[PDB]
Design a protein around this ligand. Structure first.
Ligand SMILES: CCc1cc(NC(=O)C(=O)N2C[C@@H](C)CC[C@@H]2c2ccc3sc(C4CCN(C)CC4)nc3c2)cnc1N
Ligand SMILES: CCc1cc(NC(=O)C(=O)N2C[C@@H](C)CC[C@@H]2c2ccc3sc(C4CCN(C)CC4)nc3c2)cnc1N
Ligand SMILES: CSC[C@H]1O[C@@H](n2cnc3c(N)ncnc32)[C@H](O)[C@@H]1O
Ligand SMILES: CSC[C@H]1O[C@@H](n2cnc3c(N)ncnc32)[C@H](O)[C@@H]1O
Ligand SMILES: [Cl-]
Ligand SMILES: [Cl-]
Ligand SMILES: [Cl-]
Ligand SMILES: [Cl-]
Ligand SMILES: [Cl-]
Ligand SMILES: [Cl-]
Ligand SMILES: [Cl-]
Lengths: 302, 625, 625, 303
């Protein structure tokens, strides 16, 4: 396996999905892995399925239970299908419609469409069944840092880029994008996370290590907390009814926050950037994190 | 054809990628030297101590491949101008690391992006890197023709793209470059990689880049329209732009993924080649003067210096101008000698400045074409050319031509001349002191005599060319004024520049000059209307001469004699470039001064802002009598 | 092979003569531009007004033929230094005329003769011509190896040729040149066309011309001996001289009529070609360094500057030196670890200054050759080479090699080293500050530890090379001391020079240096015996180094390691050349100074005459710590 | 106190005039080297051949007097920037003649006027004169604080003086200087002789000249108000300006005839001296650092 682990996503039945890349050395490629034994990761020997991609992987997301959506460095969006035996991983399609690196992907609520953001300033909507791009938007003025599909609406999603714009979308509207000024022109947004229960509320991290809670109704920065010392790379809510919020950062630390953005758990276990973190559907207090130190850490949250 | 390269931000195997782009026909490859997403920390632990290797090894390619085929790219996560202090300090070290590794590989060029107004700290770090160990490193500044904010789709509900006119704002992307280019003190190792988008702006936004050091033009695959068969093509405006760029001889860089997936990557490059081949082939003038494009040469001084042989040789290879001289002499002969006196009236015809004898042969051909008698004098002060003249006179001309080896201002003629034919003009007409020479030679001209040329006039026009400005600036020599190179003209085949106003006449001389109070000193003021914002760097100079009646010669672009390649335009630069806005008027002053020994030009801009008086007392440039 | 030309003083038809000399195989032709017997008067009438043409026309050849094939010759009747005033002024005018015509033709070279002691006015006129309308014109000074007076037959009754010893007089023909060369202030456009006579003088008279700009060697047909078959050949001494000249890559010029009349003119040129082919083929060292002959380069500073990739590459392409290092490490391993401890005793072996890892591989090979265990540290402060080191360590070396990316003077080692291996030496041994680096790295060396190299020593030798002196003189740059180029050393493959005394050791350093009062400052005085008359222009510098016991490296010409091409010699020049006579001793002083930040060399000649102290306070050259 | 000079355009006897201005207390005298109305022709005959002498002799004063006491003045008829080509060519030679004679006398300074926007050819001729034989010659550019057009009385019926605000226009007289100063490439031998009028402009027009090489301040007798006793005084704003100029240590030049005819010429200079003495005496800081005013020194490096 390549050193730099990028994505860790739990499947509903408990299986863990890993997406890794090699960001140094002779080869700059990537790989996908499925582990039905979670504690066996990242060891390639005790593995359930594995595949080597031509190029690295920037973001990753599940498509149901057998589909794996990949944003590639090659500018491609790639759908890999899982084998009948769930021992092989085969490329269902690989479309080169983005010009630069595809840096983020997110599946819409219906599970039949997806949204992708790329370093080519563009954002693209995809019909996964037809394997085509329905809509292509150029709403930002800098590289798109994150796209996050709404869990409840198939026409709504959030996006954030280095042009300091946070955009709420509604593909039904003629002008789908809408800028959320929050408080006032602050630091660049880097991560987005919808609230699982309330559809009017979300959270975003910035490059200065601050995580903020915003309500679209009030269109104003409801809350903000200086959680990390460096850029915030990911925000993932817990599946429980009372949602815990895991925050990742380039300071090599993980933080767990409550409703009021107060710090609960904190792990210095990673000695490199923390890339992804997913909660186990079999134990809603277990949280699996990955990083560029090739380390897969399982945390127990009180 | 086209020199070109492929821009990729994804390189899994450097050897396989290079082989692929070579088989696709590309000449070079722009690629990242570190992985684009592999952000690095230089201050705070633990990521500070990330174990290497930090990138791929330099052994994977030969030194020649690094030197010729690989163009480095700054990683997109490096933000030297971030409002966050931590990110700024970290990106400083990251940019230094990547630039130092690019120089370590010996790469011919390194791409750095400009996509906001404030690139001050980026410019500071790059300027410090340039002055830390002098190398042959070149730097291409990726500047978009249209800013990404002014290219976005109008799909934001509460942030609409304003549909109103903004002249200066539409050019902001150049301002960026300009400021950056000014912050680095006009480094010759910093150039432009102009990126072209889907929507092309107004023609003035494009003309803005005239006179700028554009080494590369970046075309994405997104801007290519699809053909009926499925091939990639471009709009007619994009094609006009491609031709304009091909004239500047820039390298074209394809970026983005292949969207015309039925074909190969060869299709985009093939469209570019097909455009390049289907351009009108080079005419004789452009064919000869293609190598002289923007080549700075000092003005010749045929009076003070004796010209070499090959200089006269390139003068003689110009059939258009000698045909013009022959026709003028023919018409003058017909107008002076009636038909009933063709065998009784012989004309005294003196060639003042004969060279190696092209004007003598032209006079003979005109005489036999007009069916008249002429006695020829070939006056030349260059004895090395007098050798050629006397060999010609012995072997061919005979006693009809009398060779006179002296200066026309000193020669005591045995008889007075009906016609005097001279070739003493320069690029600025009188910059080689034809007025003084023909004035000294005027006493042996008959009272009803004719001078060919009968008149000449100089023309000036303000130009913008940061390229030529930096070329002049690089002419600083030891043991003289550090700014003397700006206070002297240069004969140059102008290219990659921008005329800012229509040429206007400067100085005019007439021969013969019956005036009692003869004075060749001149003082002229010129007001040039400017319709566009730009930066004045100097003044182009041309001339027009009337040889006889409607027979004229000219290098002035509007009335340029077709196919004549004896003179190139001249250039009077200025020390400091002058910002000019739309509607402003460039007012320039020009003096032609002289004493007993020297003649020189002084000039100074008075509007929209004053400059220093250039070449005062001819301290930097003089023309010897 | 040989580039050559034919010298003729009789040219009836220039085209026929050029075609003949071309079909004979010659590359160029030395011919008069005016008829040799056609004396011209410039002052007194009536001959002053002689009707032209004064010579043949410039139309008779193409510009390329004038530029490449024709070498001009000064007419023999021109005597600028005549005792008669009239002849002096007339010859001034004629010499100016002929030189100006040669420049008008664009000739690549122009021959002027030196055949007496006083050529002062000739030098004055030529110097004025050089500084009047400067072109790329080159001038060959025809100087005979032996004066015609000292070659004449002893057939004058009342004027016998003295058969006694005169060391200085036998070299008078060089003095001529020297004086002339000094009068023209060492013009780069003035060179030597050494004419070789029948009798060759003593070896010192010939060695006099070592270090002089010899562009041409003139051979007459009279000096050629006749072969058994009837072909022309030369004596063994003449052939030795021909080989010595071929090393300098001079052009050979045949003069005189064909005396071996049975054959063609091809025979002389064919003998020269046959000599050129039958020379020992180029050795690898000379093959690589042929292009570097007398090329001045600034010394590398691997400590202050991070070296580029291809520099490390040329360092690694040297199998002899790495074989030597491997053998030294092998012997040290054997001497430190007994046979009965080969599997129990593991050695700490630190490569300080690892580069891209040739010494690491050498250490591994030496370990497996000696059958011993080693743990390797690869210390390197250049991060760009640390990239290569870490790629090697990941892909090949494994955990056996630990790469350390820091300075050896700052690194806090985890364990102490049994052996430390370094290649921090320069051309002058310590000019790259190997002593300071190895002193800072000495604390993590074991009490009984070994340093490879264990010792090194620098060597100096006075040299004579007006060529290299003028090359250094031409390194003057704007914005600094006009004489700073003389106060700094240059790494250069020495060629066309003359060592004046056997090299003597200058500075010596030993590692480890257990001395309590460590001081790397040095002050050395050197007395070099000189057996010949010459002119000191600078001091060549070499080094020897003991890596371990009898394993040594050396660029010193006497003990030079065979086939090693990692270092070229160094050169410390002086501002003013110093005349040295036979028997005199050149006493030079050298200082190695330093402060907290910089190390530099100061030097000054004290005998036979004092010079200025060069590079005081390192004002012109410093080596950064 | 005050270093000062007297500006006269009428000098019948140079010795008598110099003695008079010396007895009046002045330190120098600005006077014409050629008669102001004695226009000369350099091209067209017959006036081209006007018999000499063209001016008074250089023997009439000692070399020291020429070096220290006499400031030359360009004749007012010389118009190098005239729209008429003949007048332009003639004034070029006239200006060269007068400048060369001033340098021949070894005068410490030479006054030249700026009273229009276009002084380009004037600047060209002066720049050529500066670079023709290097001397210690200094040149004072007479620039009015307010242009004569913006100072005239509103007494023209069909050409009224506009009573509206114009910020940049009110400073035009500096622009002139600036352009001139830029055309001569910032010559150290070219300075300002700021002329002060009756009406003082806005404070920004005055502040404009902060940081400019003002060597002389020209005061006419017309701007002096009359005292109850009959002496000459100035307004409070004029006095503030005089203090500001005294801080810069400029030389004050009195021009115009004596209008307070009951007194002598000593009265104007006495008012200036009385203003200079009645200024707060130098404190310790200014006393120590008076010589260090605008003295460039490299920064110390005690480490
Ligand atoms: C028709 C009559 C005529 C023509 C001209 N025309 C020009 O001068 C002119 O535009 N060009 C530009 C182009 C056409 C080439 C020719 C000539 C030009 C200009 C500048 C230099 S410098 C230079 C080097 C020569 C070798 N040496 C050792 C160093 C100086 N050679 C040239 C040659 C001027 N005068 C008269 N009378
Ligand atoms: C074995 C270990 C070793 C060797 C040496 N040897 C030398 O230096 C030396 O003799 N040569 C001469 C020949 C063999 C070639 C290599 C090297 C040399 C010297 C001077 C310069 S200047 C230069 C330019 C490069 C391009 N950049 C942009 C500008 C500077 N490149 C060189 C290269 C010194 N030190 C140590 N440690
Ligand atoms: C054809 S370029 C102009 C020619 O006129 C010659 N020429 C220029 N000035 C004079 C002069 N005053 N008298 C004679 N020939 C001249 C030059 O030497 C050159 O051959
Ligand atoms: C093989 S050329 C000399 C090598 O030693 C390295 N070097 C020189 N001085 C030091 C030092 N003080 N610490 C570490 N490496 C050094 C240089 O970077 C270069 O790679
Ligand atoms: Cl422009
Ligand atoms: Cl353009
Ligand atoms: Cl005309
Ligand atoms: Cl002689
Ligand atoms: Cl230095
Ligand atoms: Cl100001
Ligand atoms: Cl003020």
């Amino acid at each position: 396996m390549e050193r730099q682990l990028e994505a860790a996503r739990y499947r509903s039945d408990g299986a863990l999905l890993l997406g890794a890349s090699s960001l140094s050395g002779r080869c700059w490629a990537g790989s996908l892995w499925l582990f039905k034994d979670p504690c066996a990761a990242p060891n390639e020997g005790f593995c359930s399925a594995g595949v080597q991609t031509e190029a690295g992987v920037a973001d990753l997301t599940w498509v149901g239970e057998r589909g794996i959506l990949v944003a590639s460095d090659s500018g491609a969006v790639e759908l890999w299908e899982l084998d009948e035996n769930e021992t092989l991983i085969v490329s269902k399609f690989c479309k080169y419609e983005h010009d630069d690196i595809v840096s983020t992907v997110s599946v819409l609520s219906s599970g039949t469409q997806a949204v992708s953001g790329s370093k080519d300033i563009c954002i693209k909507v995809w019909d996964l069944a037809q394997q085509v791009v329905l809509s292509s938007y150029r709403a930002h003025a800098a590289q798109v840092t994150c796209v996050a599909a709404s869990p409840h609406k198939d026409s709504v999603f959030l996006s954030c880029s280095e042009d300091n714009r946070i955009l709420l979308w509604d593909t039904r509207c003629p002008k789908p994008a809408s800028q959320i000024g929050c408080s006032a022109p602050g630091y660049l947004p880097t991560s987005l996370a919808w609230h699982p229960q309330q559809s009017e509320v979300f959270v975003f991290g910035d490059e200065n290590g601050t995580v903020s809670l915003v309500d679209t109704k009030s269109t104003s920065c409801v809350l903000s907390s200086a959680v990390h010392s460096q850029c915030v790379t990911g925000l993932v809510f817990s599946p429980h009814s009372v949602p815990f919020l895991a925050s990742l950062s380039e300071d090599c630390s993980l933080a767990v926050l409550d409703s009021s953005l107060s710090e609960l758990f904190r792990s210095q276990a990673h000695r490199d950037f923390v890339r992804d973190a997913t909660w186990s559907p079999l134990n809603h207090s277990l949280l699996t994190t990955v990083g560029w130190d090739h380390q897969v850490v399982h945390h127990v949250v009180p | 054809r086209v020199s070109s390269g492929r821009d990729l931000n994804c390189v899994p195997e450097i050897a396989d990628t290079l082989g692929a782009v070579a088989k696709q026909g590309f000449d070079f490859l722009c690629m990242p030297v570190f992985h684009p997403r592999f952000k690095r920390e230089f201050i705070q632990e633990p990521a500070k101590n990330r174990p290497g290797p930090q990138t791929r090894s330099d052994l994977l390619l030969s030194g020649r491949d690094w030197n010729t085929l690989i163009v480095g790219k700054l990683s997109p996560w490096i933000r030297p101008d971030s409002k966050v202090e931590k990110i700024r300090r970290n990106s400083e070290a990251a940019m230094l690391q990547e630039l130092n590794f690019g120089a370590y590989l010996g790469l011919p060029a390194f791409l750095l992006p400009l996509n906001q107004e404030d690139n001050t700290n980026l410019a500071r770090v790059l300027t410090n890197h340039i002055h830390t160990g002098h190398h042959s490193s070149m730097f291409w500044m990726r500047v978009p023709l249209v800013a990404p904010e002014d290219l976005r789709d109008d799909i934001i509900e509460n942030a609409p793209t304003t549909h109103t006119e903004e002249y200066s704002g539409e050019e902001k992307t150049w301002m960026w470059w300009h400021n950056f280019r000014t912050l680095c003190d006009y480094s010759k190792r910093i150039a432009v990689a102009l990126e072209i988008g889907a929507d092309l702006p107004s023609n003035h936004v494009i003309d803005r880049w005239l006179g700028e050091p554009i080494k590369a033009a970046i075309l994405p695959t997104s801007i290519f329209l699809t053909n009926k068969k499925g091939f990639p093509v471009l709009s007619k405006m994009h094609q006009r732009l491609i031709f304009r760029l091909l004239k500047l001889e820039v390298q074209f860089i394809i970026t983005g993924t292949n969207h015309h997936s039925e074909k190969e990557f060869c299709s985009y490059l093939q469209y570019l080649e097909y455009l390049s081949q289907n351009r009108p082939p080079p005419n004789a003038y452009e064919l000869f003067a293609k190598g002289y494009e923007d080549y700075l040469q000092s003005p010749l001084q045929p009076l003070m210096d004796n010209l070499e042989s090959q200089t006269y040789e390139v003068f003689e290879k110009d059939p258009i101008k000698y045909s013009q001289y022959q026709q003028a002499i023919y018409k003058c002969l017909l107008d002076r000698v009636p038909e009933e006196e063709k065998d009784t009236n012989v004309q005294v015809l003196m060639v003042l400045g004969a060279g190696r004898g092209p004007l003598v042969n032209a006079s003979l051909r005109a005489a036999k074409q007009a069916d008249r008698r002429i006695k020829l004098y070939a006056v030349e002060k260059n004895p090395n050319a007098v050798v050629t003249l006397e060999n010609w006179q012995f072997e061919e001309w005979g006693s009809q031509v009398t060779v006179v080896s002296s200066d026309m201002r000193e020669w005591v003629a045995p008889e007075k001349a009906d016609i005097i034919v001279s070739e003493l003009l320069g690029s600025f007409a009188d910059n080689e002191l034809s007025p003084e020479c023909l004035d000294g030679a005027q006493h042996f001209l008959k009272d009803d005599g004719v001078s060919i040329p009968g008149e000449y006039t100089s023309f000036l026009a303000p130009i913008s060319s940061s390229k030529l400005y930096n070329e002049v600036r690089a002419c600083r020599e030891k043991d003289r004024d550090p700014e003397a190179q700006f206070e002297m003209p240069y004969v140059v085949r102008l290219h990659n520049f921008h005329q800012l106003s229509a040429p206007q006449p400067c100085f005019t001389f007439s021969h013969p000059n019956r005036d009692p109070m003869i004075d060749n000193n001149r003082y002229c003021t010129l007001e040039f209307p400017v319709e566009v914002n730009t930066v004045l760097h100097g003044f182009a100079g041309y001339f027009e001469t009337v040889l006889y009646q409607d027979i004229t010669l000219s290098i002035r672009p509007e009335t340029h004699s077709p196919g004549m390649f004896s003179w190139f335009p001249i250039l009077f630069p200025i020390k400091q470039p002058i910002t000019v806005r739309e509607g402003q008027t460039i007012c320039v002053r020009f003096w032609r001064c002289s004493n007993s020994k020297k003649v020189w030009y002084e000039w100074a801009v008075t509007a929209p802002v004053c400059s220093a008086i250039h070449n005062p007392t001819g301290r930097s440039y003089t023309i010897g009598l």
